[PDB]
Amino acid sequence: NTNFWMFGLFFFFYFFIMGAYFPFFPIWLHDINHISKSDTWIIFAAISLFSLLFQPLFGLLSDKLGLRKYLLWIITGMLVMFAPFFIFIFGPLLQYNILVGSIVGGIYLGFCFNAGAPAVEAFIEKVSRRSNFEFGRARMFGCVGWALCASIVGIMFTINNQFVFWLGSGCALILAVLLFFAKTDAFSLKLALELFRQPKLWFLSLYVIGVSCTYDVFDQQFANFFTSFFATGEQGTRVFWYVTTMGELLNASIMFFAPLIINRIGGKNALLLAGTIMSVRIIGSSFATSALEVVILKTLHMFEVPFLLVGCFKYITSQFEVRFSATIYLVCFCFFKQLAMIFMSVLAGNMYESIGFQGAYLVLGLVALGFTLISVFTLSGPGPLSL
Numbered sequence: 423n424t425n426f427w428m429f430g431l432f433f434f435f436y437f438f439i440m441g442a443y444f445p446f447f448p449i450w451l452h453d454i455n456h457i458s459k460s461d462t463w464i465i466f467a468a469i470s471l472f473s474l475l476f477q478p479l480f481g482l483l484s485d486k487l488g489l490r491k492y493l494l495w496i497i498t499g500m501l502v503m504f505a506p507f508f509i510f511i512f513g514p515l516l517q518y519n520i521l522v523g524s525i526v527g528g529i530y531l532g533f534c535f536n537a538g539a540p541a542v543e544a545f546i547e548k549v550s551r552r553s554n555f556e557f558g559r560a561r562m563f564g565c566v567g568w569a570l571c572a573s574i575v576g577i578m579f580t581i582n583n584q585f586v587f588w589l590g591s592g593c594a595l596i597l598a599v600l601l602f603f604a605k606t607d608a609f610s611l612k613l614a615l616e617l618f619r620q621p622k623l624w625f626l627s628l629y630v631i632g633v634s635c636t637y638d639v640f641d642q643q644f645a646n647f648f649t650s651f652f653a654t655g656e657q658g659t660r661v662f663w664y665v666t667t668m669g670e671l672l673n674a675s676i677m678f679f680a681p682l683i684i685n686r687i688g689g690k691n692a693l694l695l696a697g698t699i700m701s702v703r704i705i706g707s708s709f710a711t712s713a714l715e716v717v718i719l720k721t722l723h724m725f726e727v728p729f730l731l732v733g734c735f736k737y738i739t740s741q742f743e744v745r746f747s748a749t750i751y752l753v754c755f756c757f758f759k760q761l762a763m764i765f766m767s768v769l770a771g772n773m774y775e776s777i778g779f780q781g782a783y784l785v786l787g788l789v790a791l792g793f794t795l796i797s798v799f800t801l802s803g804p805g806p807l808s809l
């Protein structure tokens with residue numbers, strides 16, 4: 423099949439390039455650029471600031487272009503600059519000169535990745551229902567491409583720590599290739615503003631601010647929580663990329679069967695089920711005592727992704743007009759998720775101190791479970807009462 427294999431490999435090489443930068447990002451600043459953690463909380467604040475003017479902006483374009491590939495050409499164009507970004511630009515600029523004047527080099531990561539990954543999901547999602555395949559399939563490539571690169575980072579961490587970027591950049595032109603050969607064949611912005619007074623959006627986004635925002639702030643400093651339950655902070659880290667690498671292969675597997683499960687259960691129960699798996703991880707982490715316990719908890723993250731990603735599209739397409747699938751994705755499951763993740767993280771630090779780590783996860787989990795249970799009623803569609 424023409425589109426499936428091209429855009430399936432597109433995810434493979436796209437997330438390979440996100441898998442070098444992202445899943446080990448704080449370490450890069452910590453060790454390899456010697457940046458204090460009283461300064462990395464300001465870098466993320468600017469990588470998430472250019473993400474807020476791009477994410478909605480990418481949503482309207484990703485619809486107005488429809489199946490036109492221009493917006494995805496820009497991304498594949500900017501991703502070629504990946505190697506000389508980290509190695510020669512971003513790297514020396516943040517340290518030697520002021521962090522503020524280099525925190526605007528997090529514009530790059532705002533465009534390509536934080537606001538560009540979901541634009542790739544959304545676009546390939548539209549193509550996913552003009553060809554004959556399921557979005558969960560092909561998207562499953564992202565996890566294994568993420569896993570492949572994930573291993574190589576650790577495998578290459580002491581050998582040549584610039585290599586992952588150089589290889590990453592080489593895949594960007596491979597990404598240009600697959601974008602070209604693949605062959606694939608409305609609204610106005612004032613109709614777009616109609617959705618914001620439709621009360622069916624308010625309850626979808628409520629679910630995101632409630633369940634998904636709480637979950638992604640929970641997975642913020644999970645690295646600090648995870649390490650304590652290994653004998654050495656360092657040795658626990660050395661087992662961390664093992665879990666991440668391995669569990670992502672499982673994650674693709676879970677996603678493999680995801681769309682079949684998703685297609686009948688329906689969209690709403692897909693999110694409710696995702697919300698339950700999310701809440702279970704957030705609450706049950708309060709009852710963590712041993713390494714095996716915390717390891718298995720982290721693997722719930724691999725049960726969670728398929729249902730959230732695949733499910734949200736099934737929801738957005740099923741209950742909303744498709745003339746807005748990219749927009750209400752990049753505004754609800756990305757923008758509104760990111761906008762609320764500014765504040766829910768702020769008082770997650772005033773809960774690390776105010777009531778400890780496991781006591782912080784308890785407040786979050788009962789807000790996560792809180793809004794999961796609430797969205798059986800606020801979300802329109804068929805609830806779990808049907809089966």
Ligand SMILES: CCCCCCCCCO[C@@H]1O[C@H](CO)[C@@H](O)[C@H](O)[C@H]1O
Pocket residue numbers: 509510511514582584585
């Ligand atoms: C504006 C200031 C920019 C400073 C940039 C410093 C670049 C240093 C590059 O080092 C080289 O890296 C290669 C891999 O990238 C290795 O193969 C090689 O052994 C090593 O010598």
Ligand SMILES: O=[N+]([O-])c1ccc(O[C@H]2O[C@H](CO)[C@H](O)[C@H](O)[C@H]2O)cc1
Pocket residue numbers: 437440444535536537539540564565568670673727
């Ligand atoms: O910028 N974002 O919006 C964004 C970046 C990375 C990301 O990673 C997810 O997909 C990855 C590959 O599939 C892994 O599975 C990972 O475990 C998931 O969390 C998700 C969202």
